[PDB]
Structure 1
Amino acid sequence: APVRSLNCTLRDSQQKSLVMSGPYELKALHLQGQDMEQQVVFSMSFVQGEESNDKIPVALGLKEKNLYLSCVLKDDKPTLQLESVDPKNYPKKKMEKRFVFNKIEINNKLEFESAQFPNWYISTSQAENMPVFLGGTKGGQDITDFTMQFVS
């Protein structure tokens, strides 16, 4: 059958919202009130991959747009990019590995590990208005934990 998807927003554990930073980047900033319309709505697809009770493979497409978060090497480093796809073929259940995140639920928070690059995580900075990026430790000063909000 089709692939199943949910509309959602994400906030980092310091409660920073995610917005577009030009066409192929997201940034994280503190948002409240009218400006909350500026947040990206993810279509989170539940995709093929290794799965356990608390580790669920997803793709983070942007709702209504043929864009996906993806993990690739850039100048020899695992990086997070927004990648365009053929809108006729996406979403699909068997998403390519660069698009897959393991959504991990620990202590009422979510982490998104790259399926492609083990122990690399969707990350934000503590500073306002900095890129969302792929970071190589769920440790340290950078933020690797999120909450999801469901959208109609």
Structure 2
Amino acid sequence: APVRSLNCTLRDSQQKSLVMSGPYELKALHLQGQDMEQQVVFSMSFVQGEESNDKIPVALGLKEKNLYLSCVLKDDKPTLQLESVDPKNYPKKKMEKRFVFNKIEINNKLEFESAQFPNWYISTSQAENMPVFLGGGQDITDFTMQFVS
């Protein structure tokens, strides 16, 4: 059938919200009140890949944008980018591996591991207004997920 998707937001375990940082980056900052409209709404797609009770393969697209989080090599290490795709072809059930995250439930939170790069996770900094990155400590790898209409 058609790939299944849900709209959602993510916050890090320090309750920082994610926002756009120019066209191909996200940043995390403390947001409350009217400013919470700046937060990115994801379309989380449930994709093909290796699955267990608490390991669920997803893609993270920006709602109604042909942009996906992807894990791509740079300076010889796994890194997080926003990548444009053909809007005719996405989302799809068989997403390419660079777009796949294992959504893992650990102690009432979520971690998003790169399917491509084992043990590299979507991360934030403790400081305000710094990029979201891929991290292999002080950095934050746990999130909560709010399901949106």
- TM normalised by structure 1 equals 0.98
3-state secondary structure, aligned to 1:141: coil
Deviation at 1:144, TM superposition (A): 0.1
Alignment RMSD (CA, Å):
0.3
Q: Distance in 2 between matches of 1:69 and 1:26?
A: 10
Segments of 5+ residues of structure 1 without an aligned counterpart are none
Deviation at 1:76, TM superposition (A): 1.4
Deviation at 1:11, TM superposition (A): 0.0
Aligned counterpart for 2:145 among listed residues 139, 144, 148: 148
Q: Distance in 1 between matches of 2:64 and 2:81?
A: 18
Cα deviations by residue, 1:13-65 (Å, 9 ceiling, x for unpaired): 00000000000000000000000000000000000000000000000001100
Structure 2 partner of 1:35: 35
Structure 1 segments of 4 or more deviating over 4 A? none
Task: Between 71-80 and 56-65, report the one with greater CA deviation.
Answer: 71-80
Cα deviations by residue, 1:60-80 (Å, 9 ceiling, x for unpaired): 001100000000101212100
Number of residue equivalences: 149
Percent of aligned positions that are identical: 100
Q: Distance in 1 between matches of 2:35 and 2:61?
A: 22
3-state secondary structure, aligned to 2:36: helix
3-state secondary structure, aligned to 2:60: strand
3-state secondary structure, aligned to 2:37: helix
Cα deviations by residue, 1:72-123 (Å, 9 ceiling, x for unpaired): 1012121000000000000000000000000000110000000000000000
3-state secondary structure, aligned to 1:98: helix
Segments of 5+ residues of structure 2 without an aligned counterpart are none
Cα deviations by residue, 1:116-146 (Å, 9 ceiling, x for unpaired): 000000000000000000001xxx0000000
